[PDB]
Protein backbone atom coordinates (compact mmCIF):
# COMPACT_ATOMS: atom_id res chain seq x y z
CA UNK A 1 0.00 0.00 0.00
CA UNK A 2 1.22 3.52 -0.80
CA UNK A 3 2.70 5.54 2.01
CA UNK A 4 3.28 9.21 2.54
CA UNK A 5 7.01 9.67 2.67
CA UNK A 6 8.80 12.50 4.43
CA UNK A 7 12.51 13.21 4.77
CA UNK A 8 14.60 14.86 7.44
CA UNK A 9 18.23 15.92 8.02
CA UNK A 10 19.43 17.40 11.32
CA UNK A 11 22.16 17.29 13.94
CA UNK A 12 21.70 13.70 15.11
CA UNK A 13 25.23 13.34 16.46
CA UNK A 14 28.00 15.61 17.75
CA UNK A 15 28.06 18.49 20.26
CA UNK A 16 24.72 20.08 19.27
CA UNK A 17 22.75 16.90 18.84
CA UNK A 18 20.24 17.92 21.53
CA UNK A 19 18.36 19.61 18.64
CA UNK A 20 18.51 16.95 15.92
CA UNK A 21 17.83 14.00 18.20
CA UNK A 22 15.15 15.95 20.11
CA UNK A 23 13.39 16.83 16.84
CA UNK A 24 13.77 13.28 15.59
CA UNK A 25 11.99 11.91 18.67
CA UNK A 26 9.25 14.53 18.22
CA UNK A 27 8.63 13.75 14.54
CA UNK A 28 8.63 9.98 15.18
CA UNK A 29 6.07 10.50 17.90
CA UNK A 30 3.87 12.67 15.66
CA UNK A 31 4.16 10.01 12.91
CA UNK A 32 3.11 7.19 15.27
CA UNK A 33 0.15 9.21 16.55
CA UNK A 34 -1.24 10.00 13.09
CA UNK A 35 -0.62 6.41 12.03
CA UNK A 36 -2.46 5.05 15.08
CA UNK A 37 -5.51 6.92 13.76
CA UNK A 38 -5.18 5.52 10.23
CA UNK A 39 -2.50 7.83 8.82
CA UNK A 40 -3.52 10.78 6.71
CA UNK A 41 -6.93 10.00 5.27
CA UNK A 42 -6.09 6.32 5.46
CA UNK A 43 -2.55 6.50 4.08
CA UNK A 44 0.26 5.70 6.52
CA UNK A 45 3.23 8.08 7.01
CA UNK A 46 6.87 6.97 6.81
CA UNK A 47 10.05 8.80 7.63
CA UNK A 48 11.73 7.44 4.53
CA UNK A 49 15.00 9.33 5.09
CA UNK A 50 16.60 10.48 8.37
CA UNK A 51 20.04 11.90 7.71
CA UNK A 52 22.69 13.30 10.01
CA UNK A 53 24.37 16.65 9.27
CA UNK A 54 25.84 17.35 12.76
CA UNK A 55 24.81 21.05 12.51
CA UNK A 56 27.46 21.27 9.74
CA UNK A 57 26.64 23.29 6.59
CA UNK A 58 28.57 21.12 4.09
CA UNK A 59 26.97 17.94 5.39
CA UNK A 60 23.52 19.57 5.27
CA UNK A 61 24.02 20.39 1.56
CA UNK A 62 24.88 16.77 0.73
CA UNK A 63 21.90 15.54 2.76
CA UNK A 64 19.35 17.91 1.25
CA UNK A 65 20.65 16.97 -2.24
CA UNK A 66 20.04 13.31 -1.35
CA UNK A 67 16.58 13.95 0.07
CA UNK A 68 15.46 16.12 -2.87
CA UNK A 69 16.76 13.42 -5.24
CA UNK A 70 14.10 11.06 -3.91
CA UNK A 71 11.04 11.95 -6.00
CA UNK A 72 8.70 10.18 -3.56
CA UNK A 73 9.46 12.51 -0.64
CA UNK A 74 6.47 14.79 -0.24
CA UNK A 75 7.78 17.10 2.49
CA UNK A 76 10.87 17.79 4.55
CA UNK A 77 11.66 18.62 8.16
CA UNK A 78 14.85 20.74 7.84
CA UNK A 79 18.08 20.89 9.89
CA UNK A 80 18.67 22.74 13.09
CA UNK A 81 21.07 25.60 12.77
CA UNK A 82 21.15 28.79 10.78
CA UNK A 83 24.45 27.75 9.16
CA UNK A 84 23.05 24.52 7.64
CA UNK A 85 19.68 26.16 6.78
CA UNK A 86 21.30 29.08 4.96
CA UNK A 87 23.55 26.67 3.02
CA UNK A 88 20.57 24.71 1.67
CA UNK A 89 17.77 27.29 1.53
CA UNK A 90 18.11 28.34 -2.14
CA UNK A 91 18.01 24.68 -3.24
CA UNK A 92 15.02 23.96 -1.02
CA UNK A 93 13.17 27.03 -2.25
CA UNK A 94 13.81 26.15 -5.91
CA UNK A 95 12.61 22.58 -5.36
CA UNK A 96 9.28 23.79 -4.06
CA UNK A 97 8.18 20.90 -1.83
CA UNK A 98 6.82 21.89 1.59
CA UNK A 99 9.69 22.39 3.94
CA UNK A 100 9.37 22.87 7.68
CA UNK A 101 12.07 24.88 9.47
CA UNK A 102 11.78 23.85 13.08
CA UNK A 103 14.63 25.68 14.78
CA UNK A 104 16.89 28.10 12.86
CA UNK A 105 16.26 31.65 14.14
CA UNK A 106 17.83 33.85 11.47
CA UNK A 107 14.82 35.64 9.94
CA UNK A 108 16.05 35.42 6.29
CA UNK A 109 15.60 31.64 6.45
CA UNK A 110 11.89 32.43 5.93
CA UNK A 111 11.78 36.09 4.88
CA UNK A 112 14.72 36.88 2.61
CA UNK A 113 13.47 40.45 2.14
CA UNK A 114 14.03 41.19 5.86
CA UNK A 115 10.48 42.20 6.76
CA UNK A 116 9.00 39.47 8.98
CA UNK A 117 5.56 38.33 7.88
CA UNK A 118 5.95 39.60 4.33
CA UNK A 119 6.92 37.76 1.11
CA UNK A 120 8.07 34.50 2.68
CA UNK A 121 9.81 31.80 0.69
CA UNK A 122 6.72 30.15 -0.75
CA UNK A 123 7.33 26.56 0.37
CA UNK A 124 8.97 27.26 3.74
CA UNK A 125 7.17 27.27 7.10
CA UNK A 126 8.98 28.04 10.32
CA UNK A 127 8.52 26.81 13.89
CA UNK A 128 11.50 28.77 15.14
CA UNK A 129 11.49 31.61 17.58
CA UNK A 130 12.93 34.22 15.20
CA UNK A 131 15.77 36.44 16.39
CA UNK A 132 13.87 39.68 15.79
CA UNK A 133 11.16 38.26 18.02
CA UNK A 134 13.29 36.88 20.86
CA UNK A 135 15.18 40.20 20.95
CA UNK A 136 12.04 42.12 21.90
CA UNK A 137 11.70 40.51 25.34
CA UNK A 138 15.46 40.18 25.98
CA UNK A 139 16.17 43.77 24.87
CA UNK A 140 13.46 45.26 27.09
CA UNK A 141 14.78 43.28 29.99
CA UNK A 142 18.43 44.22 29.49
CA UNK A 143 17.64 47.89 28.82
CA UNK A 144 15.74 48.14 32.10
CA UNK A 145 17.99 46.09 34.39
CA UNK A 146 21.51 46.99 33.21
CA UNK A 147 23.67 49.98 32.20
CA UNK A 148 26.82 48.39 30.81
CA UNK A 149 25.93 45.35 28.71
CA UNK A 150 28.61 43.39 26.90
CA UNK A 151 27.49 41.06 24.14
CA UNK A 152 29.18 37.78 23.11
CA UNK A 153 27.97 35.68 20.19
CA UNK A 154 28.87 32.58 18.18
CA UNK A 155 30.17 33.44 14.72
CA UNK A 156 27.17 32.25 12.71
CA UNK A 157 24.20 34.12 11.29
CA UNK A 158 22.30 33.12 14.44
CA UNK A 159 24.94 34.88 16.50
CA UNK A 160 25.51 37.77 14.12
CA UNK A 161 21.87 38.60 13.40
CA UNK A 162 21.18 37.93 17.07
CA UNK A 163 23.43 40.75 18.24
CA UNK A 164 22.04 43.18 15.64
CA UNK A 165 18.46 42.58 16.70
CA UNK A 166 19.39 42.56 20.39
CA UNK A 167 21.22 45.87 20.21
CA UNK A 168 18.38 47.40 18.17
CA UNK A 169 15.77 46.32 20.72
CA UNK A 170 17.88 47.66 23.57
CA UNK A 171 18.04 51.03 21.73
CA UNK A 172 14.33 51.08 20.95
CA UNK A 173 13.49 50.67 24.65
CA UNK A 174 15.80 53.56 25.55
CA UNK A 175 18.57 51.43 27.03
CA UNK A 176 22.26 52.33 26.88
CA UNK A 177 24.32 51.09 23.89
CA UNK A 178 26.30 47.90 24.62
CA UNK A 179 29.74 48.81 25.95
CA UNK A 180 31.54 45.88 24.24
CA UNK A 181 30.91 43.12 21.72
CA UNK A 182 32.87 40.04 20.71
CA UNK A 183 32.51 36.67 19.03
CA UNK A 184 33.69 33.07 19.30
CA UNK A 185 33.61 30.12 16.88
CA UNK A 186 31.37 27.16 17.81
CA UNK A 187 33.43 24.72 19.84
CA UNK A 188 36.06 27.26 20.95
CA UNK A 189 37.79 26.03 24.15
CA UNK A 190 39.48 29.33 25.11
CA UNK A 191 37.37 32.46 25.64
CA UNK A 192 39.79 34.35 27.91
CA UNK A 193 40.41 37.15 25.43
CA UNK A 194 36.70 37.94 24.98
CA UNK A 195 35.88 37.84 28.72
CA UNK A 196 38.96 39.96 29.51
CA UNK A 197 37.55 42.49 27.07
CA UNK A 198 34.20 42.40 28.85
CA UNK A 199 36.06 42.91 32.14
CA UNK A 200 38.03 45.95 30.88
CA UNK A 201 34.74 47.47 29.74
CA UNK A 202 33.34 47.15 33.32
CA UNK A 203 30.22 45.24 32.19
CA UNK A 204 27.38 44.76 34.65
CA UNK A 205 25.98 41.97 32.48
CA UNK A 206 26.99 39.80 29.55
CA UNK A 207 24.43 38.83 26.94
CA UNK A 208 25.31 35.75 24.93
CA UNK A 209 23.83 34.41 21.72
CA UNK A 210 24.82 30.81 20.99
CA UNK A 211 24.33 27.23 22.16
CA UNK A 212 24.64 25.21 25.36
CA UNK A 213 28.08 23.61 25.05
CA UNK A 214 29.63 27.00 24.25
CA UNK A 215 27.72 29.04 26.80
CA UNK A 216 29.04 26.69 29.51
CA UNK A 217 32.63 27.41 28.44
CA UNK A 218 31.87 31.13 28.52
CA UNK A 219 30.24 30.91 31.94
CA UNK A 220 33.17 28.95 33.36
CA UNK A 221 35.61 31.49 31.89
CA UNK A 222 33.78 34.41 33.50
CA UNK A 223 34.05 32.61 36.85
CA UNK A 224 37.71 31.92 36.25
CA UNK A 225 38.48 35.61 35.60
CA UNK A 226 36.31 36.85 38.47
CA UNK A 227 33.67 38.36 36.20
CA UNK A 228 30.64 37.82 38.43
CA UNK A 229 27.77 39.43 36.56
CA UNK A 230 24.52 38.03 35.22
CA UNK A 231 24.73 36.06 31.98
CA UNK A 232 21.72 36.63 29.78
CA UNK A 233 21.57 33.89 27.16
CA UNK A 234 19.46 33.01 24.14
CA UNK A 235 16.75 30.28 24.37
CA UNK A 236 18.81 27.86 22.31
CA UNK A 237 21.65 27.92 24.83
CA UNK A 238 19.73 27.02 27.94
CA UNK A 239 19.77 23.28 27.31
CA UNK A 240 21.15 20.12 28.96
CA UNK A 241 24.64 20.87 27.69
CA UNK A 242 24.65 24.21 29.54
CA UNK A 243 23.34 22.83 32.84
CA UNK A 244 25.78 19.95 32.76
CA UNK A 245 28.83 21.99 31.71
CA UNK A 246 28.18 24.92 34.03
CA UNK A 247 26.92 23.08 37.10
CA UNK A 248 26.48 25.45 40.04
CA UNK A 249 27.37 28.39 37.78
CA UNK A 250 23.99 28.14 36.10
CA UNK A 251 22.66 30.11 39.07
CA UNK A 252 21.79 33.63 37.93
CA UNK A 253 21.90 32.84 34.23
CA UNK A 254 18.70 33.97 32.60
CA UNK A 255 17.12 33.89 29.21
CA UNK A 256 14.10 34.43 27.05
CA UNK A 257 12.34 31.13 26.37
CA UNK A 258 9.29 29.74 24.63
CA UNK A 259 7.07 29.28 27.69
CA UNK A 260 5.01 26.27 26.61
CA UNK A 261 6.11 23.90 29.38
CA UNK A 262 5.89 26.45 32.17
CA UNK A 263 3.25 25.73 34.77
CA UNK A 264 0.48 25.62 34.30
CA UNK A 265 0.70 24.16 30.79
CA UNK A 266 -2.03 24.46 28.23
CA UNK A 267 -3.65 21.28 27.04
CA UNK A 268 -1.55 20.65 23.94
CA UNK A 269 1.76 20.93 25.88
CA UNK A 270 0.36 18.71 28.65
CA UNK A 271 -0.95 16.15 26.14
CA UNK A 272 2.39 16.08 24.37
CA UNK A 273 4.42 15.82 27.60
CA UNK A 274 2.33 12.83 28.67
CA UNK A 275 2.88 11.00 25.37
CA UNK A 276 6.57 11.85 25.25
CA UNK A 277 7.13 10.55 28.77
CA UNK A 278 5.10 7.40 28.08
CA UNK A 279 7.46 6.45 25.20
CA UNK A 280 10.86 7.86 26.16
CA UNK A 281 10.61 8.23 29.93
CA UNK A 282 12.08 11.13 31.86
CA UNK A 283 15.09 11.20 29.49
CA UNK A 284 17.76 13.88 28.83
CA UNK A 285 15.23 16.05 27.01
CA UNK A 286 12.65 15.78 29.74
CA UNK A 287 15.25 16.73 32.30
CA UNK A 288 15.89 15.91 35.96
CA UNK A 289 12.37 16.41 37.41
CA UNK A 290 9.94 13.48 36.90
CA UNK A 291 6.91 15.67 37.57
CA UNK A 292 7.75 18.63 35.31
CA UNK A 293 9.29 18.61 31.83
CA UNK A 294 12.09 21.16 31.41
CA UNK A 295 11.31 24.43 29.58
CA UNK A 296 13.99 23.65 27.01
CA UNK A 297 11.81 20.89 25.54
CA UNK A 298 10.05 23.62 23.59
CA UNK A 299 13.11 24.46 21.53
CA UNK A 300 14.67 21.02 21.32
CA UNK A 301 11.61 18.79 20.85
CA UNK A 302 8.15 20.29 20.52
CA UNK A 303 9.07 22.65 17.69
CA UNK A 304 9.71 19.51 15.58
CA UNK A 305 6.44 18.03 16.85
CA UNK A 306 4.45 21.08 15.80
CA UNK A 307 6.30 21.18 12.44
CA UNK A 308 5.29 17.56 11.74
CA UNK A 309 1.66 18.03 12.84
CA UNK A 310 1.27 21.12 10.66
CA UNK A 311 2.78 19.35 7.64
CA UNK A 312 0.43 16.40 8.17
CA UNK A 313 -2.58 18.65 8.70
CA UNK A 314 -1.76 20.41 5.46
CA UNK A 315 -1.69 17.11 3.58
CA UNK A 316 -4.95 16.08 5.30
CA UNK A 317 -6.71 19.31 4.37
CA UNK A 318 -5.35 19.24 0.79
CA UNK A 319 -6.37 15.57 0.45
CA UNK A 320 -3.33 15.42 -1.79
CA UNK A 321 0.46 15.44 -1.50
CA UNK A 322 0.84 17.78 -4.54
CA UNK A 323 3.26 20.44 -3.30
CA UNK A 324 1.23 23.49 -4.31
CA UNK A 325 -1.91 21.92 -2.83
CA UNK A 326 -0.23 21.13 0.51
CA UNK A 327 1.28 24.62 0.68
CA UNK A 328 -2.08 26.28 0.01
CA UNK A 329 -3.74 24.05 2.66
CA UNK A 330 -1.10 24.96 5.28
CA UNK A 331 -1.73 28.62 4.40
CA UNK A 332 -5.38 27.97 5.19
CA UNK A 333 -4.68 26.81 8.77
CA UNK A 334 -6.10 29.08 11.44
CA UNK A 335 -5.64 28.84 15.20
CA UNK A 336 -4.22 25.31 15.17
CA UNK A 337 -3.49 24.41 18.80
CA UNK A 338 0.16 23.41 18.71
CA UNK A 339 2.38 22.76 21.69
CA UNK A 340 4.49 25.89 21.39
CA UNK A 341 1.85 28.33 20.20
CA UNK A 342 -1.40 28.59 18.29
CA UNK A 343 -0.56 28.57 14.54
CA UNK A 344 -2.20 30.73 11.89
CA UNK A 345 -0.51 30.81 8.51
CA UNK A 346 -1.28 32.66 5.31
CA UNK A 347 0.31 33.50 1.95
CA UNK A 348 2.30 36.17 3.82
CA UNK A 349 2.67 34.66 7.28
CA UNK A 350 4.91 31.60 7.40
CA UNK A 351 5.99 31.63 11.11
CA UNK A 352 3.98 31.11 14.31
CA UNK A 353 5.82 32.05 17.50
CA UNK A 354 5.39 35.69 18.61
CA UNK A 355 6.33 37.58 21.79
CA UNK A 356 3.18 36.36 23.63
CA UNK A 357 4.70 32.89 23.40
CA UNK A 358 7.89 33.76 25.31
CA UNK A 359 8.94 35.06 28.71
CA UNK A 360 12.18 35.75 30.58
CA UNK A 361 13.29 33.03 32.99
CA UNK A 362 16.05 32.78 35.56
CA UNK A 363 17.87 29.86 37.20
CA UNK A 364 17.04 29.91 40.92
CA UNK A 365 17.94 27.43 43.68
CA UNK A 366 15.03 25.20 44.68
CA UNK A 367 16.11 23.44 47.86
CA UNK A 368 19.20 21.57 46.66
CA UNK A 369 18.44 21.65 42.93
CA UNK A 370 18.65 24.44 40.32
CA UNK A 371 15.71 25.28 38.03
CA UNK A 372 14.19 28.01 35.85
CA UNK A 373 11.47 30.28 37.17
CA UNK A 374 9.89 33.21 35.38
CA UNK A 375 11.27 36.65 36.26
CA UNK A 376 9.36 38.97 38.59
Ligand SMILES: O=C(O)c1cccc(O)c1
Pocket residue numbers: 019080081082083103104105106156158211235236237299
Ligand atom coordinates in the same frame (compact mmCIF):
# COMPACT_ATOMS: atom_id res chain seq x y z
O1 LIG B 1 19.57 29.63 14.53
C1 LIG B 1 20.31 28.72 14.97
O2 LIG B 1 21.41 28.44 14.44
C2 LIG B 1 19.84 27.95 16.18
C3 LIG B 1 20.29 26.65 16.47
C4 LIG B 1 19.83 25.97 17.59
C5 LIG B 1 18.91 26.58 18.46
C6 LIG B 1 18.47 27.87 18.18
O3 LIG B 1 17.57 28.48 19.01
C7 LIG B 1 18.93 28.56 17.04
